[PDB]
Design a protein around this nucleic acid. Structure first.
Ligand code: GCP
Ligand code: MET
Ligand code: MG
Ligand code: ZN
Lengths: 396, 77, 23
RNA sequence: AGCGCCGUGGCGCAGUGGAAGCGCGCAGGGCUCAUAACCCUGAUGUCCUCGGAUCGAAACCGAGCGGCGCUACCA
Protein backbone atom coordinates (compact mmCIF):
# COMPACT_ATOMS: atom_id res chain seq x y z
CA UNK A 1 0.00 0.00 0.00
CA UNK A 2 0.95 3.67 0.36
CA UNK A 3 2.62 5.26 3.39
CA UNK A 4 3.02 8.95 2.47
CA UNK A 5 1.20 11.05 -0.12
CA UNK A 6 3.33 12.85 -2.72
CA UNK A 7 2.30 15.37 -5.37
CA UNK A 8 3.83 17.17 -8.33
CA UNK A 9 3.21 20.74 -9.49
CA UNK A 10 4.30 22.58 -12.62
CA UNK A 11 3.31 25.22 -15.12
CA UNK A 12 1.14 24.52 -18.16
CA UNK A 13 2.87 22.84 -21.12
CA UNK A 14 5.67 21.79 -18.77
CA UNK A 15 5.34 18.03 -18.22
CA UNK A 16 4.41 16.24 -15.01
CA UNK A 17 2.21 13.29 -16.01
CA UNK A 18 4.97 11.72 -18.10
CA UNK A 19 7.50 12.61 -15.39
CA UNK A 20 5.49 10.64 -12.82
CA UNK A 21 5.04 7.90 -15.43
CA UNK A 22 8.84 7.68 -15.58
CA UNK A 23 8.82 7.76 -11.77
CA UNK A 24 5.97 5.33 -11.07
CA UNK A 25 5.00 3.58 -14.31
CA UNK A 26 1.22 3.93 -14.13
CA UNK A 27 -0.39 5.60 -17.14
CA UNK A 28 -2.34 8.82 -16.61
CA UNK A 29 -5.63 8.20 -18.39
CA UNK A 30 -6.50 11.89 -18.95
CA UNK A 31 -9.96 10.92 -20.16
CA UNK A 32 -13.30 12.53 -21.23
CA UNK A 33 -12.08 13.16 -24.84
CA UNK A 34 -11.12 16.82 -24.21
CA UNK A 35 -8.58 16.53 -21.38
CA UNK A 36 -6.13 14.63 -23.62
CA UNK A 37 -4.53 17.81 -25.00
CA UNK A 38 -5.29 21.04 -23.05
CA UNK A 39 -5.64 20.32 -19.32
CA UNK A 40 -7.28 17.79 -17.02
CA UNK A 41 -10.16 18.17 -14.56
CA UNK A 42 -10.03 15.08 -12.36
CA UNK A 43 -6.88 14.18 -10.45
CA UNK A 44 -4.18 11.89 -11.78
CA UNK A 45 -3.00 8.89 -9.76
CA UNK A 46 0.13 6.74 -9.70
CA UNK A 47 2.00 4.33 -7.43
CA UNK A 48 5.76 4.16 -6.94
CA UNK A 49 8.02 1.27 -5.95
CA UNK A 50 10.88 1.95 -3.53
CA UNK A 51 13.16 -1.06 -3.10
CA UNK A 52 16.57 0.42 -2.35
CA UNK A 53 19.81 -1.42 -3.12
CA UNK A 54 22.55 -0.76 -0.56
CA UNK A 55 25.58 -2.73 -1.77
CA UNK A 56 14.46 1.17 -8.31
CA UNK A 57 11.55 0.17 -10.54
CA UNK A 58 11.68 -3.52 -9.78
CA UNK A 59 11.75 -5.47 -6.50
CA UNK A 60 14.62 -7.49 -8.02
CA UNK A 61 17.70 -5.63 -9.26
CA UNK A 62 19.72 -6.68 -12.32
CA UNK A 63 20.62 -3.36 -14.00
CA UNK A 64 23.38 -2.25 -11.55
CA UNK A 65 25.53 -5.19 -12.69
CA UNK A 66 25.91 -6.93 -9.35
CA UNK A 67 23.21 -9.65 -9.16
CA UNK A 68 22.18 -8.35 -5.73
CA UNK A 69 18.51 -7.38 -5.62
CA UNK A 70 16.80 -4.68 -3.59
CA UNK A 71 14.76 -5.08 -0.40
CA UNK A 72 11.41 -3.57 0.54
CA UNK A 73 11.84 -0.03 1.87
CA UNK A 74 8.95 2.22 0.82
CA UNK A 75 5.86 2.25 -1.39
CA UNK A 76 4.60 5.79 -1.95
CA UNK A 77 1.53 7.05 -3.81
CA UNK A 78 1.57 10.01 -6.20
CA UNK A 79 -1.31 12.44 -6.80
CA UNK A 80 -0.93 14.34 -10.08
CA UNK A 81 -2.60 17.74 -9.71
CA UNK A 82 -3.19 20.03 -12.72
CA UNK A 83 -1.37 23.36 -12.58
CA UNK A 84 -3.69 25.57 -14.65
CA UNK A 85 -5.64 28.76 -13.99
CA UNK A 86 -9.09 27.36 -14.82
CA UNK A 87 -9.12 24.77 -12.02
CA UNK A 88 -7.82 25.56 -8.54
CA UNK A 89 -10.27 23.95 -6.10
CA UNK A 90 -9.14 20.40 -6.89
CA UNK A 91 -5.55 21.68 -6.80
CA UNK A 92 -6.10 22.89 -3.23
CA UNK A 93 -7.90 19.65 -2.35
CA UNK A 94 -4.91 17.60 -3.49
CA UNK A 95 -2.56 20.11 -1.85
CA UNK A 96 -4.20 19.44 1.50
CA UNK A 97 -4.02 15.74 0.62
CA UNK A 98 -0.33 15.62 -0.35
CA UNK A 99 2.50 15.48 2.19
CA UNK A 100 5.53 15.61 -0.14
CA UNK A 101 6.07 18.03 -3.01
CA UNK A 102 7.86 18.05 -6.36
CA UNK A 103 8.01 21.39 -8.19
CA UNK A 104 8.91 21.79 -11.87
CA UNK A 105 10.85 24.77 -13.25
CA UNK A 106 11.30 25.34 -16.99
CA UNK A 107 14.61 26.63 -18.30
CA UNK A 108 14.23 28.28 -21.71
CA UNK A 109 10.79 29.71 -20.89
CA UNK A 110 10.34 32.62 -18.49
CA UNK A 111 12.24 31.58 -15.38
CA UNK A 112 9.48 32.85 -13.05
CA UNK A 113 6.60 30.72 -14.25
CA UNK A 114 3.40 32.15 -12.75
CA UNK A 115 1.67 28.85 -12.03
CA UNK A 116 4.83 27.26 -10.60
CA UNK A 117 5.24 30.13 -8.13
CA UNK A 118 1.49 30.22 -7.44
CA UNK A 119 1.41 26.53 -6.53
CA UNK A 120 4.65 26.89 -4.57
CA UNK A 121 2.82 29.53 -2.52
CA UNK A 122 -0.09 27.09 -2.21
CA UNK A 123 2.40 24.46 -0.98
CA UNK A 124 3.76 26.91 1.59
CA UNK A 125 0.19 27.74 2.67
CA UNK A 126 -0.78 24.24 3.83
CA UNK A 127 2.25 23.21 5.93
CA UNK A 128 4.30 21.75 3.07
CA UNK A 129 8.01 22.61 3.19
CA UNK A 130 9.90 19.48 2.04
CA UNK A 131 9.96 20.43 -1.65
CA UNK A 132 12.45 19.24 -4.26
CA UNK A 133 13.01 21.64 -7.15
CA UNK A 134 13.17 19.65 -10.38
CA UNK A 135 14.49 21.03 -13.66
CA UNK A 136 11.86 19.37 -15.84
CA UNK A 137 13.84 20.20 -19.01
CA UNK A 138 17.52 19.21 -19.12
CA UNK A 139 18.35 18.11 -22.68
CA UNK A 140 16.85 21.34 -24.09
CA UNK A 141 19.43 23.56 -22.34
CA UNK A 142 23.09 24.40 -22.81
CA UNK A 143 25.59 24.08 -19.97
CA UNK A 144 25.94 27.86 -19.58
CA UNK A 145 22.17 28.24 -19.89
CA UNK A 146 21.76 25.56 -17.22
CA UNK A 147 24.17 27.42 -14.93
CA UNK A 148 22.29 30.69 -15.51
CA UNK A 149 18.99 28.98 -14.71
CA UNK A 150 20.51 27.41 -11.58
CA UNK A 151 21.62 30.83 -10.33
CA UNK A 152 18.24 32.34 -11.24
CA UNK A 153 16.37 29.63 -9.31
CA UNK A 154 18.71 30.10 -6.35
CA UNK A 155 18.36 33.90 -6.28
CA UNK A 156 14.58 33.74 -6.72
CA UNK A 157 14.03 31.15 -3.98
CA UNK A 158 16.15 32.28 -1.01
CA UNK A 159 13.86 33.82 1.62
CA UNK A 160 10.56 32.01 1.01
CA UNK A 161 9.02 29.59 3.50
CA UNK A 162 10.47 26.70 1.50
CA UNK A 163 14.19 27.35 2.08
CA UNK A 164 15.79 23.90 2.03
CA UNK A 165 14.84 22.74 -1.46
CA UNK A 166 17.31 20.33 -3.10
CA UNK A 167 17.53 20.51 -6.89
CA UNK A 168 17.29 17.50 -9.22
CA UNK A 169 17.62 17.12 -13.03
CA UNK A 170 14.81 15.13 -14.68
CA UNK A 171 13.22 14.61 -18.08
CA UNK A 172 10.05 12.95 -19.32
CA UNK A 173 11.63 10.87 -22.11
CA UNK A 174 15.11 9.66 -21.11
CA UNK A 175 14.27 7.80 -17.86
CA UNK A 176 17.65 8.41 -16.21
CA UNK A 177 18.91 9.88 -12.94
CA UNK A 178 15.67 8.49 -11.50
CA UNK A 179 17.15 6.67 -8.50
CA UNK A 180 18.27 10.10 -7.30
CA UNK A 181 14.60 11.13 -7.18
CA UNK A 182 13.65 8.10 -5.07
CA UNK A 183 16.71 8.56 -2.85
CA UNK A 184 15.91 12.21 -2.16
CA UNK A 185 12.22 11.41 -1.60
CA UNK A 186 13.18 8.83 1.02
CA UNK A 187 15.80 11.09 2.62
CA UNK A 188 14.40 14.63 2.70
CA UNK A 189 10.75 13.65 3.18
CA UNK A 190 9.81 11.63 6.29
CA UNK A 191 6.40 10.10 6.92
CA UNK A 192 4.35 12.39 9.21
CA UNK A 193 3.28 10.89 12.56
CA UNK A 194 0.31 8.64 11.74
CA UNK A 195 -0.60 5.83 14.14
CA UNK A 196 -3.52 4.41 16.12
CA UNK A 197 -3.70 7.28 18.63
CA UNK A 198 -5.76 9.82 16.68
CA UNK A 199 -9.37 9.01 15.84
CA UNK A 200 -10.01 7.85 12.26
CA UNK A 201 -11.36 10.23 9.62
CA UNK A 202 -11.57 10.30 5.83
CA UNK A 203 -11.47 12.90 3.05
CA UNK A 204 -12.92 11.80 -0.30
CA UNK A 205 -11.62 13.69 -3.32
CA UNK A 206 -13.12 11.87 -6.34
CA UNK A 207 -16.23 9.99 -7.45
CA UNK A 208 -16.02 6.67 -9.32
CA UNK A 209 -19.21 5.32 -10.89
CA UNK A 210 -18.92 1.54 -11.28
CA UNK A 211 -21.65 0.09 -13.53
CA UNK A 212 -20.20 -2.18 -16.23
CA UNK A 213 -22.28 -1.48 -19.36
CA UNK A 214 -23.57 -4.31 -21.49
CA UNK A 215 -23.30 -6.77 -18.62
CA UNK A 216 -26.38 -8.10 -16.86
CA UNK A 217 -27.41 -5.81 -14.00
CA UNK A 218 -28.17 -8.76 -11.70
CA UNK A 219 -24.58 -8.52 -10.36
CA UNK A 220 -23.15 -4.99 -10.25
CA UNK A 221 -20.76 -3.24 -7.88
CA UNK A 222 -21.70 -0.34 -5.62
CA UNK A 223 -20.05 3.06 -5.29
CA UNK A 224 -16.29 3.34 -4.94
CA UNK A 225 -14.51 6.60 -4.08
CA UNK A 226 -10.94 7.81 -3.69
CA UNK A 227 -10.07 8.90 -0.17
CA UNK A 228 -7.19 10.02 2.04
CA UNK A 229 -6.79 9.45 5.78
CA UNK A 230 -4.88 11.91 7.96
CA UNK A 231 -5.35 9.79 11.11
CA UNK A 232 -6.01 6.18 12.08
CA UNK A 233 -6.46 2.90 10.21
CA UNK A 234 -9.62 1.80 8.39
CA UNK A 235 -10.60 -1.86 8.74
CA UNK A 236 -13.20 -3.89 6.88
CA UNK A 237 -16.59 -4.36 8.52
CA UNK A 238 -17.35 -0.82 9.69
CA UNK A 239 -20.26 1.58 9.25
CA UNK A 240 -19.25 4.89 7.66
CA UNK A 241 -21.08 8.13 6.90
CA UNK A 242 -20.55 10.57 4.04
CA UNK A 243 -21.27 13.68 6.10
CA UNK A 244 -21.78 16.47 3.50
CA UNK A 245 -24.50 14.17 2.20
CA UNK A 246 -27.38 14.69 -0.21
CA UNK A 247 -29.55 17.69 -1.01
CA UNK A 248 -33.22 17.08 -0.23
CA UNK A 249 -30.95 24.77 0.37
CA UNK A 250 -30.02 22.07 2.89
CA UNK A 251 -28.01 18.84 2.97
CA UNK A 252 -28.39 15.71 5.08
CA UNK A 253 -25.90 12.94 5.88
CA UNK A 254 -25.37 9.69 3.97
CA UNK A 255 -24.91 6.39 5.81
CA UNK A 256 -23.35 3.26 4.34
CA UNK A 257 -21.26 0.17 5.08
CA UNK A 258 -17.85 -0.80 3.73
CA UNK A 259 -17.78 -3.51 1.06
CA UNK A 260 -14.14 -3.37 -0.05
CA UNK A 261 -10.95 -1.31 0.31
CA UNK A 262 -8.75 -1.33 -2.79
CA UNK A 263 -5.19 -0.65 -1.57
CA UNK A 264 -2.84 0.16 -4.45
CA UNK A 265 -2.97 -3.30 -6.06
CA UNK A 266 -5.72 -5.29 -4.34
CA UNK A 267 -8.28 -5.30 -1.51
CA UNK A 268 -6.56 -5.16 1.88
CA UNK A 269 -8.45 -5.45 5.16
CA UNK A 270 -6.27 -2.90 7.00
CA UNK A 271 -4.46 0.18 5.70
CA UNK A 272 -2.00 2.46 7.50
CA UNK A 273 -3.03 6.07 6.77
CA UNK A 274 -1.07 8.30 4.43
CA UNK A 275 -2.19 7.05 1.03
CA UNK A 276 -5.09 7.25 -1.38
CA UNK A 277 -7.42 4.27 -0.94
CA UNK A 278 -10.41 3.11 -2.96
CA UNK A 279 -13.30 2.79 -0.53
CA UNK A 280 -16.06 0.76 -2.17
CA UNK A 281 -19.35 0.90 -0.28
CA UNK A 282 -23.07 0.24 -0.79
CA UNK A 283 -23.62 3.89 -1.77
CA UNK A 284 -25.66 4.52 -4.90
CA UNK A 285 -23.38 4.77 -7.97
CA UNK A 286 -25.30 7.85 -9.16
CA UNK A 287 -24.02 9.61 -6.03
CA UNK A 288 -20.57 8.66 -7.38
CA UNK A 289 -21.35 9.46 -11.03
CA UNK A 290 -20.64 13.16 -11.60
CA UNK A 291 -18.22 15.39 -9.70
CA UNK A 292 -20.11 14.67 -6.47
CA UNK A 293 -17.66 12.99 -4.06
CA UNK A 294 -15.09 15.70 -4.72
CA UNK A 295 -13.95 17.18 -1.42
CA UNK A 296 -16.24 15.54 1.14
CA UNK A 297 -15.36 14.93 4.79
CA UNK A 298 -16.24 11.39 5.85
CA UNK A 299 -16.60 9.89 9.30
CA UNK A 300 -16.36 6.42 10.78
CA UNK A 301 -19.44 5.70 12.88
CA UNK A 302 -18.94 6.48 16.54
CA UNK A 303 -18.11 10.13 15.77
CA UNK A 304 -20.44 13.09 15.19
CA UNK A 305 -19.08 15.63 12.69
CA UNK A 306 -20.81 18.99 13.06
CA UNK A 307 -22.56 20.54 10.06
CA UNK A 308 -22.00 24.30 9.82
CA UNK A 309 -23.28 27.15 7.65
CA UNK A 310 -21.86 30.18 9.50
CA UNK A 311 -18.11 29.81 10.05
CA UNK A 312 -15.72 32.07 11.98
CA UNK A 313 -12.32 32.07 10.28
CA UNK A 314 -8.91 33.55 11.03
CA UNK A 315 -7.53 34.54 7.62
CA UNK A 316 -4.34 36.17 6.37
CA UNK A 317 -3.44 37.59 2.96
CA UNK A 318 -0.06 38.04 1.31
CA UNK A 319 1.31 41.34 -0.03
CA UNK A 320 0.86 40.75 -3.78
CA UNK A 321 -1.29 38.74 -6.16
CA UNK A 322 -0.23 35.39 -7.61
CA UNK A 323 -0.51 33.65 -10.97
CA UNK A 324 0.13 36.61 -13.30
CA UNK A 325 3.22 37.37 -15.39
CA UNK A 326 -0.55 42.84 -15.10
CA UNK A 327 -0.25 42.45 -11.32
CA UNK A 328 -1.95 44.59 -8.67
CA UNK A 329 -1.63 45.07 -4.93
CA UNK A 330 -3.61 42.89 -2.54
CA UNK A 331 -6.77 44.75 -1.56
CA UNK A 332 -8.56 44.30 1.75
CA UNK A 333 -11.82 42.39 1.58
CA UNK A 334 -15.16 44.14 1.03
CA UNK A 335 -18.53 42.93 2.36
CA UNK A 336 -20.97 41.22 -0.03
CA UNK A 337 -18.51 39.58 -2.39
CA UNK A 338 -18.63 35.84 -3.02
CA UNK A 339 -15.16 34.45 -2.24
CA UNK A 340 -14.21 30.80 -2.57
CA UNK A 341 -13.17 29.31 0.77
CA UNK A 342 -11.75 25.80 0.30
CA UNK A 343 -11.68 23.95 3.62
CA UNK A 344 -8.77 21.66 2.77
CA UNK A 345 -10.70 19.89 0.03
CA UNK A 346 -14.21 21.40 -0.17
CA UNK A 347 -15.41 23.55 -3.09
CA UNK A 348 -17.90 26.15 -1.86
CA UNK A 349 -17.79 29.90 -2.40
CA UNK A 350 -18.93 31.68 0.75
CA UNK A 351 -20.51 35.07 1.34
CA UNK A 352 -18.70 37.41 3.73
CA UNK A 353 -20.99 38.78 6.43
CA UNK A 354 -18.47 40.12 8.97
CA UNK A 355 -15.22 41.84 7.95
CA UNK A 356 -12.16 42.33 10.16
CA UNK A 357 -8.47 42.91 9.50
CA UNK A 358 -7.56 39.40 10.72
CA UNK A 359 -10.95 37.74 11.37
CA UNK A 360 -14.07 36.98 9.35
CA UNK A 361 -17.51 35.39 9.35
CA UNK A 362 -18.49 33.51 6.19
CA UNK A 363 -21.68 31.70 5.19
CA UNK A 364 -21.52 28.70 2.85
CA UNK A 365 -24.37 28.03 0.45
CA UNK A 366 -23.77 24.31 1.06
CA UNK A 367 -23.18 23.45 4.74
CA UNK A 368 -19.94 21.66 5.52
CA UNK A 369 -18.64 19.56 8.40
CA UNK A 370 -15.96 20.69 10.84
CA UNK A 371 -14.01 18.40 13.17
CA UNK A 372 -10.73 19.91 14.41
CA UNK A 373 -8.87 22.35 12.16
CA UNK A 374 -9.37 21.53 8.45
CA UNK A 375 -6.99 24.16 7.02
CA UNK A 376 -8.42 26.48 4.35
CA UNK A 377 -7.43 28.47 1.26
CA UNK A 378 -8.99 31.74 0.06
CA UNK A 379 -9.56 32.79 -3.56
CA UNK A 380 -11.20 35.91 -5.00
CA UNK A 381 -12.64 36.86 -8.40
CA UNK A 382 -10.32 39.44 -9.95
CA UNK A 383 -8.74 38.18 -13.19
CA UNK A 384 -11.97 36.80 -14.73
CA UNK A 385 -11.34 33.56 -12.83
CA UNK A 386 -10.40 32.36 -9.35
CA UNK A 387 -7.20 33.94 -7.99
CA UNK A 388 -5.57 32.99 -4.69
CA UNK A 389 -5.29 35.86 -2.20
CA UNK A 390 -4.60 34.21 1.15
CA UNK A 391 -5.16 31.40 3.61
CA UNK A 392 -7.90 30.70 6.14
CA UNK A 393 -8.49 28.60 9.27
CA UNK A 394 -11.67 27.68 11.15
CA UNK A 395 -11.82 28.96 14.73
CA UNK A 396 -14.94 28.39 16.84
CA UNK B 1 -12.27 18.27 -38.75
CA UNK B 2 -13.88 21.42 -40.19
CA UNK B 3 -12.02 20.73 -43.43
CA UNK B 4 -12.79 22.99 -46.40
CA UNK B 5 -12.17 22.37 -50.10
CA UNK B 6 -13.14 23.98 -53.40
CA UNK B 7 -13.87 21.90 -56.50
CA UNK B 8 -14.69 23.11 -60.01
CA UNK B 9 -17.00 25.73 -58.37
CA UNK B 10 -18.45 24.42 -55.11
CA UNK B 11 -17.12 25.04 -51.60
CA UNK B 12 -17.50 21.92 -49.45
CA UNK B 13 -17.01 22.53 -45.73
CA UNK B 14 -18.28 25.81 -44.27
CA UNK B 15 -18.31 26.94 -40.62
CA UNK B 16 -21.77 27.92 -39.38
CA UNK B 17 -20.62 30.83 -37.19
CA UNK B 18 -22.19 33.38 -39.57
CA UNK B 19 -25.50 33.37 -41.43
CA UNK B 20 -25.44 31.88 -44.91
CA UNK B 21 -27.54 34.41 -46.83
CA UNK B 22 -25.19 37.29 -45.98
CA UNK B 23 -22.32 35.07 -47.15
CA UNK B 24 -24.18 34.73 -50.46
CA UNK B 25 -24.89 38.48 -50.46
CA UNK B 26 -21.20 39.40 -50.19
CA UNK B 27 -20.16 36.52 -52.47
CA UNK B 28 -22.26 37.43 -55.50
CA UNK B 29 -21.22 41.09 -55.49
CA UNK B 30 -17.53 40.50 -54.79
CA UNK B 31 -17.29 37.76 -57.45
CA UNK B 32 -19.95 38.74 -59.99
CA UNK B 33 -21.14 35.17 -60.46
CA UNK B 34 -24.30 33.13 -60.14
CA UNK B 35 -24.60 31.93 -56.56
CA UNK B 36 -26.34 28.84 -55.19
CA UNK B 37 -26.82 27.49 -51.67
CA UNK B 38 -27.40 23.80 -52.39
CA UNK B 39 -28.07 21.74 -49.25
CA UNK B 40 -27.44 18.16 -50.25
CA UNK B 41 -28.44 15.75 -47.45
CA UNK B 42 -25.50 15.27 -45.06
CA UNK B 43 -22.65 16.25 -47.36
CA UNK B 44 -20.47 19.29 -46.91
CA UNK B 45 -22.88 22.17 -47.42
CA UNK B 46 -22.76 23.25 -51.05
CA UNK B 47 -22.09 26.86 -52.01
CA UNK B 48 -21.63 27.11 -55.77
CA UNK B 49 -20.28 30.06 -57.76
CA UNK B 50 -19.37 30.08 -61.43
CA UNK B 51 -16.07 30.88 -63.12
CA UNK B 52 -12.48 30.03 -62.21
CA UNK B 53 -11.81 32.54 -59.42
CA UNK B 54 -10.15 30.39 -56.76
CA UNK B 55 -7.83 33.29 -55.92
CA UNK B 56 -10.92 35.46 -55.50
CA UNK B 57 -12.51 32.71 -53.38
CA UNK B 58 -9.37 32.85 -51.25
CA UNK B 59 -9.86 36.61 -50.93
CA UNK B 60 -13.50 36.13 -49.89
CA UNK B 61 -12.78 33.39 -47.36
CA UNK B 62 -10.09 35.62 -45.85
CA UNK B 63 -12.49 38.57 -45.71
CA UNK B 64 -15.51 36.70 -44.28
CA UNK B 65 -14.25 34.75 -41.25
CA UNK B 66 -11.04 33.02 -42.32
CA UNK B 67 -7.92 33.48 -40.20
CA UNK B 68 -6.16 30.10 -40.55
CA UNK B 69 -5.50 29.66 -44.31
CA UNK B 70 -3.75 26.37 -43.52
CA UNK B 71 -6.51 23.76 -43.75
CA UNK B 72 -7.58 25.14 -47.16
CA UNK B 73 -6.21 22.86 -49.90
CA UNK B 74 -8.10 23.71 -53.08
CA UNK B 75 -7.96 20.94 -55.66
CA UNK B 76 -6.84 22.35 -58.99
CA UNK B 77 -9.19 20.44 -61.30
CA UNK C 1 22.87 24.92 -2.15
CA UNK C 2 22.66 23.54 -5.68
CA UNK C 3 26.15 22.01 -5.76
CA UNK C 4 25.18 18.29 -5.80
CA UNK C 5 22.63 18.95 -8.58
CA UNK C 6 24.98 20.10 -11.35
CA UNK C 7 26.85 16.81 -10.93
CA UNK C 8 23.67 14.86 -11.65
CA UNK C 9 22.97 17.23 -14.55
CA UNK C 10 26.41 16.44 -15.99
CA UNK C 11 25.70 12.72 -15.54
CA UNK C 12 22.37 13.22 -17.31
CA UNK C 13 24.05 14.92 -20.27
CA UNK C 14 26.69 12.18 -20.41
CA UNK C 15 24.07 9.41 -20.42
CA UNK C 16 21.91 11.19 -23.01
CA UNK C 17 24.87 11.74 -25.33
CA UNK C 18 26.00 8.12 -24.90
CA UNK C 19 22.61 6.49 -25.48
CA UNK C 20 21.34 8.92 -28.15
CA UNK C 21 24.28 10.40 -30.09
CA UNK C 22 21.80 11.29 -32.86
CA UNK C 23 20.03 13.77 -30.57
C1' A D 1 -14.63 -2.07 -22.66
C1' G D 2 -20.22 -2.52 -24.49
C1' C D 3 -24.32 -1.57 -27.79
C1' G D 4 -26.03 1.08 -32.48
C1' C D 5 -24.06 3.02 -37.94
C1' C D 6 -20.49 3.02 -42.19
C1' G D 7 -18.29 -1.56 -45.21
C1' U D 8 -16.99 1.35 -52.61
C1' G D 9 -16.52 2.80 -58.95
C1' G D 10 -12.28 8.81 -57.35
C1' C D 11 -16.94 10.12 -54.80
C1' G D 12 -22.49 10.54 -51.68
C1' C D 13 -26.42 7.46 -51.99
C1' A D 14 -29.05 2.55 -53.72
C1' G D 15 -31.67 -1.75 -53.25
C1' U D 16 -30.34 -5.27 -50.21
C1' G D 17 -32.94 -10.84 -50.52
C1' G D 18 -32.89 -12.73 -60.02
C1' A D 19 -26.62 -11.55 -60.09
C1' A D 20 -23.74 -5.63 -61.68
C1' G D 21 -27.13 -0.72 -58.48
C1' C D 22 -28.32 5.97 -59.58
C1' G D 23 -26.20 10.82 -59.95
C1' C D 24 -21.63 13.15 -59.54
C1' G D 25 -17.80 12.71 -61.75
C1' C D 26 -13.66 11.50 -66.22
C1' A D 27 -12.83 9.85 -71.85
C1' G D 28 -14.91 9.83 -76.56
C1' G D 29 -18.86 10.98 -79.97
C1' G D 30 -23.32 13.68 -81.25
C1' C D 31 -25.45 19.29 -81.64
C1' U D 32 -23.74 24.37 -83.65
C1' C D 33 -19.75 28.06 -88.16
C1' A D 34 -17.64 27.62 -82.99
C1' U D 35 -18.29 27.41 -77.63
C1' A D 36 -21.09 26.82 -73.33
C1' A D 37 -25.89 24.28 -72.73
C1' C D 38 -28.36 20.08 -74.41
C1' C D 39 -28.15 14.70 -76.41
C1' C D 40 -25.60 9.32 -76.35
C1' U D 41 -22.01 5.52 -74.98
C1' G D 42 -18.19 4.13 -71.34
C1' A D 43 -13.90 1.78 -67.40
C1' U D 44 -13.91 1.99 -62.82
C1' G D 45 -15.09 -2.98 -58.05
C1' U D 46 -13.29 -7.95 -53.92
C1' C D 47 -20.73 -3.09 -51.26
C1' C D 48 -14.40 -5.96 -45.62
C1' U D 49 -14.00 -11.54 -44.57
C1' C D 50 -16.25 -16.39 -42.27
C1' G D 51 -20.40 -19.49 -42.52
C1' G D 52 -25.91 -20.96 -42.37
C1' A D 53 -30.82 -21.24 -44.89
C1' U D 54 -30.51 -20.72 -49.88
C1' C D 55 -32.10 -24.01 -57.64
C1' G D 56 -30.50 -18.55 -56.99
C1' A D 57 -27.17 -14.38 -53.24
C1' A D 58 -23.49 -8.30 -51.73
C1' A D 59 -28.59 -8.74 -49.49
C1' C D 60 -31.87 -12.28 -44.17
C1' C D 61 -29.34 -13.78 -39.84
C1' G D 62 -25.31 -15.21 -37.03
C1' A D 63 -18.98 -14.62 -34.88
C1' G D 64 -14.60 -12.22 -36.36
C1' C D 65 -12.53 -7.54 -38.94
C1' G D 66 -11.14 -1.37 -40.09
C1' G D 67 -13.31 3.50 -38.40
C1' C D 68 -17.43 6.52 -36.21
C1' G D 69 -21.92 8.31 -31.16
C1' C D 70 -22.65 7.61 -26.19
C1' U D 71 -21.52 5.40 -21.51
C1' A D 72 -17.55 8.10 -19.41
C1' C D 73 -12.36 5.50 -17.73
C1' C D 74 -17.40 2.59 -15.41
C1' A D 75 -12.38 0.22 -8.43
N1 GCP E 1 11.38 17.10 -24.76
C1 GCP E 1 10.52 17.16 -23.60
N2 GCP E 1 9.18 17.30 -23.71
C2 GCP E 1 8.41 17.36 -22.61
C3 GCP E 1 8.97 17.27 -21.40
N3 GCP E 1 8.00 17.35 -20.48
C4 GCP E 1 6.84 17.49 -21.13
N4 GCP E 1 7.08 17.49 -22.44
C5 GCP E 1 6.05 17.62 -23.43
O1 GCP E 1 4.63 17.88 -22.69
C6 GCP E 1 3.70 17.36 -23.43
C7 GCP E 1 2.68 16.58 -22.56
O2 GCP E 1 3.27 16.21 -21.34
P1 GCP E 1 2.29 16.05 -20.02
O3 GCP E 1 3.14 15.81 -18.79
O4 GCP E 1 1.36 14.88 -20.22
O5 GCP E 1 1.42 17.44 -19.84
P2 GCP E 1 0.89 18.05 -18.40
O6 GCP E 1 2.04 18.12 -17.43
O7 GCP E 1 -0.20 17.18 -17.84
C8 GCP E 1 0.23 19.77 -18.69
P3 GCP E 1 -0.24 20.54 -17.06
O8 GCP E 1 0.98 20.61 -16.17
O9 GCP E 1 -0.77 21.94 -17.29
O10 GCP E 1 -1.31 19.71 -16.40
C9 GCP E 1 4.41 16.39 -24.40
O11 GCP E 1 4.17 16.75 -25.69
C10 GCP E 1 5.91 16.50 -24.08
O12 GCP E 1 6.70 16.56 -25.35
C11 GCP E 1 10.34 17.13 -21.29
O13 GCP E 1 10.83 17.05 -20.22
N5 GCP E 1 11.09 17.07 -22.37
C1 MET F 1 -8.53 7.02 -6.42
S1 MET F 1 -6.90 6.32 -6.59
C2 MET F 1 -6.71 5.55 -4.97
C3 MET F 1 -7.46 4.25 -4.87
C4 MET F 1 -6.79 3.09 -5.62
N1 MET F 1 -6.44 3.50 -6.97
C5 MET F 1 -7.70 1.88 -5.64
O1 MET F 1 -8.28 1.54 -6.67
MG1 MG G 1 -4.19 12.96 -15.46
ZN1 ZN H 1 9.19 10.93 -29.50
Amino acid sequence: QATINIGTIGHVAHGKSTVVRAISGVQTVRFKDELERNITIKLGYANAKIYKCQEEISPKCQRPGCPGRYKLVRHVSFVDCPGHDILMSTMLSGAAVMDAALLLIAGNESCPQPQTSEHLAAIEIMKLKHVIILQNKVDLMREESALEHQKSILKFIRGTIADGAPIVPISAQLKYNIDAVNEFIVKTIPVPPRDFMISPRLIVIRSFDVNKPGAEIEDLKGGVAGGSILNGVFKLGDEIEIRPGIVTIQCKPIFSNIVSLFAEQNDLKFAVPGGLIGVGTKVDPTLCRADRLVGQVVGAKGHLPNIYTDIEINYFLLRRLLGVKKQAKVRKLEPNEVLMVNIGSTATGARVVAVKADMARLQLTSPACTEINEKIALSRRIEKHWRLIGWATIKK
Amino acid sequence: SNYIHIRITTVQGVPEEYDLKRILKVLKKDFACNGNIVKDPEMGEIIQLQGDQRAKVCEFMISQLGLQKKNIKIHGF
Amino acid sequence: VGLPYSELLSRFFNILRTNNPEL
